[PDB]
Symmetry: D2
Subunit: 199 residues, 4 copies
């Protein structure tokens, strides 16, 4: 059991706060490309958190999956999921969804792996700013979100997973992955609890 | 659940040499259910011995992971706020020692970590790169923890992951199975040890 | 005094080993132009590198180019760009930041963008090279006492044998150029002129 | 050229502060193995800095070069510099010099490459503590110090190179490397200046 071995202990929240919005891009919001399930409701709920973040003067990062136009950086990930390779810089599918369009000062991290931390400058970007707790929204819960939450935690940041701002293709994976995160990696709670508990 | 197929997840990852083996966190603490064991870990340990012995006889690069924190908790992290038992895993605590069944021999790297992935804040990527490893077989514990973290990173780091499905262990079966699904769909070739050894 | 190096066993030979690759670091219009960030022996280094790039292309060698790029709104403005404020003007579409027409990239050659000195720091270079199984990496670019050196020490650290093309790295100032080659020869890389490198 | 192209701009100092001492270990204190030049003097001066940091409550981290007993992690670095191999965990040459012995709470970072950040948890450890400016001491100026300094900057930290607390086996490399760092990568100043200003 998790309870028996001391898992899922609370992870106290601590300022300064920042927000990471992972991979909320056109391709992931379209159920015919990489979207589906509860991903779109998650986008909508993130709108509230993003506006709170901006008002509160928190650091905000967005990630995007972007591969080179010649497929020169086509990788292991793009063998497992071929479609990832079609997320080119200027392709509509790879652009941030219009509901969550980045404002000035917000860092757009481009990646070709699931984590927004891997082979990117995100850790360094957040450390420069002294960020202590990173709120996380995005898609998918059992993909880039999970991987970005493990890395945030490993990079020394306290992850607050916004359970209603993370969306997945399929609810079993979504639930199975929230569970892991609550047990091993993160504070996990709804956006309105997060927003309340963070001022 | 049909969206995985429609959207083109779960494509086959062709195995490619040179091969290497990573054994994640099969330490006495994770073999003993009073501490971090239970579920199907013990069986994953046993089967892993065959993979280890094949690795040695085939001249494969072998690496092993250990969780280790400092004796004064000086590296106490976010990971150990969430799972405070992790902090007991000290360098010379029996609990942090690789299970005897799978003791390393000469040439086999042991990677000490304080996070879930064997790649994070360690030399593993660099160690494999220098050896030209193309496909990394993975065994270890726990499927829904350090095995999955190491597999997503292995892949990210440019290595082809091959999860030995009967050589990775968890303390609970639902998490074990749910994380196998995800890995098979997004990150690894997944097969039993005998398929894996036959095909390398 | 420098006799200590030979006594303590510095500067041993780094045997070369295929597969080979080529990194050209930051040979961009702003480092070529002596009115912006160039000068020294950088113009000469750029041209000599052409022969290496062509030879890399004849031999089918993995090839990677680096560029310093910050966000248009200074979103990713950092510590490096406080110390050297003009790097912050290296934007994606600023001609200063573009690769020099002499060395324009081709299909399959990787353009890594960075906001730090090393082509490896916070980029996917290590994993791009790993995937391709690269053992030895030839390095060219500017500046020798800057991004070149940072990139060479990283390459080494990541598991690759660096081969610093002494006549294909340039600096805006020659004293730093010569000091950093010395360091690199003593500790971090095989160091030779390009005719020598291409002959092996 | 550095002047006309905007190099060497001041790097303002910002709390919280941390201190990293790099590879001040017996092998590097010993002129017969890896020591010499002005290293012995850097170690003694560092005593002053470490005492201050402990008193002021700062995060303090010490790095060490450590390869496996069986050479399993023998690497490219260990090819150019084969003596780095000989620094096993329990070889007295890898141990931190006694004058700078760690206390409880101070992180000992083990590395098999130049930089204290590379393939280590040093960035995460400092990030979790919200360190903004990292004071740096150690050996060798033109080796592991510089490699750590450049990484510290890259990782988001403001590096403060302590010019009388970093040593090398040769004064040329030491001065060249201090020059590079001041121009591109850090605030450089003597421990007297650093301590009063922090």
């Amino acid at each position: 059991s998790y309870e028996r071995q001391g898992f899922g202990a609370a992870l106290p929240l601590k300022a300064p706060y920042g927000l990471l919005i992972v991979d909320f891009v056109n391709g992931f919001a379209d159920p015919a490309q990489f979207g589906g399930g509860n991903i779109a409701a998650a986008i909508e709920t993130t709108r509230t958190v993003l506006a709170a973040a901006r008002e509160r003067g928190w650091a905000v990062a967005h990630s995007r999956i972007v591969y080179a136009d010649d497929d020169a950086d086509g990788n292991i990930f793009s063998i497992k999921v071929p479609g990832m390779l079609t997320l080119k810089e200027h392709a509509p599918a790879s652009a941030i969804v219009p509901q969550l369009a980045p404002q000035a000062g917000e860092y757009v991290v481009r990646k070709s792996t699931p984590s927004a931390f891997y082979g990117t400058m995100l850790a360094a970007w957040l450390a420069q700013r002294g960020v202590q707790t990173l709120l996380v929204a995005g898609a998918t819960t059992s993909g880039c979100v999970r991987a970005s939450v493990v890395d945030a935690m490993s990079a020394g940041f306290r992850p607050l997973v916004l359970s209603d701002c993370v969306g997945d293709r399929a609810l079993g994976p979504h639930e199975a992955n929230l569970f892991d995160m609550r047990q091993k990696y993160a504070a996990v709670m709804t956006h309105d609890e997060a927003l309340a508990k963070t001022k």
